[PDB]
Amino acid sequence: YKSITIATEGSYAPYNFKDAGGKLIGFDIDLGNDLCKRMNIECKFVEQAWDGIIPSLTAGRYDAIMAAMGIQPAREKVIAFSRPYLLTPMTFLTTADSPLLKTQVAIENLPLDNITPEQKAELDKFTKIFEGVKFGVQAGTSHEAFMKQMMPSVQISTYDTIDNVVMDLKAGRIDASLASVSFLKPLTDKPDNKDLKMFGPRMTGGLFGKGVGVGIRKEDADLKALFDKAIDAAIADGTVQKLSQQWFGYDASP
Ligand SMILES: C[C@@H](N[C@@H](CCCN)C(=O)O)C(=O)O
């Protein structure tokens, strides 16, 4: 390799989004440039809408995906991933005045790889509470996958982008959503969003898989080995922790 094209969404702050000048910025952009510098490869970032991100990678329109992509088992059937460059649980989002906030959380940290009757009871409690509520999710995400598989009886509306989900939640058109803590903590930390609150269990594993990784074509074993080595070095020297603090306001590094 001499040069690679990396796709990003361009609308998932603070991982990847556009600055005032329309330039792609975020944790994925800074890390992507840092990993490529280590790999001694020229780096170029392209904007790609969420729906075609995986098929455009397999079709060879670009070489890699760095777009807050969860290493989910369903995505692993189609593409390969680098080792994780970030770890984050998943949680729910509502308004600060919502009665959903008074719901008792019996399991703070909910692993989903194996589901015990106690963990199922907790998911069933939340499903029954969410049955009388309007949920909104971004289409084609692990957020939609979770609602479809784990809470099918809950009424969901799907959106093109996460920004539209947040806007409708703020406008009162939906009552709740879900995303990773890495997305929701900087969102709710903004003085702009004091009327928004994270709530419910912090979930890991199962359909979510473990961590956020670089999406690569399965046949590109050499490119994966290069990214894995670069990621190991960026973690070891404190670069991932530094970039995580900068963009997320906390340490989500593996
Ligand atoms: C970490 C990030 N993962 C989402 C990203 C959605 C970006 N459009 C996913 O893997 O589907 C999140 O849930 O916050």
Numbering used by the authors: 28 to 281
From the publication, what sentences describe this entry?
The PBP OccJ is associated with the octopine transporter of octopine-type A. tumefaciens while NocT is associated with nopaline uptake in the nopaline-type A. tumefaciens. OccJ shares 47% sequence identity with NocT and belongs to cluster F within the PBP structural classification.
In contrast, we were successful in solving the structures of NocT with octopinic acid, noroctopinic acid and histopine at 2.1, 2.2 and 2.45 Å resolution, respectively. All ligands are well defined in their electron density maps. Octopinic acid and noroctopinic acid contain an ornithine moiety instead of the arginine for octopine. Local rearrangements of residues in the ligand binding site such as Glu36, Ala94, Met117 and those from the region 165–170 occur upon octopinic acid, noroctopinic acid and histopine binding compared with octopine, with Glu36 and Gln165 moving towards both shortest side chains of ornithine and histidine moieties. In contrast, the pyruvate of the octopinic acid and histopine as well as the glyoxylic acid (a CH3 shorter than pyruvate) of noroctopinic acid adopt a similar position, comparable to that of the pyruvate of octopine. The same study performed with NocT showed that NocT displays similar affinity for octopine and its family members except for histopine, which is the worst ligand as for OccJ. The structural data of NocT with octopinic acid, histopine and an octopine analogue confirm a unique binding mode with a unique conformation of the ketoacid moiety, which is different from that observed in OccJ.
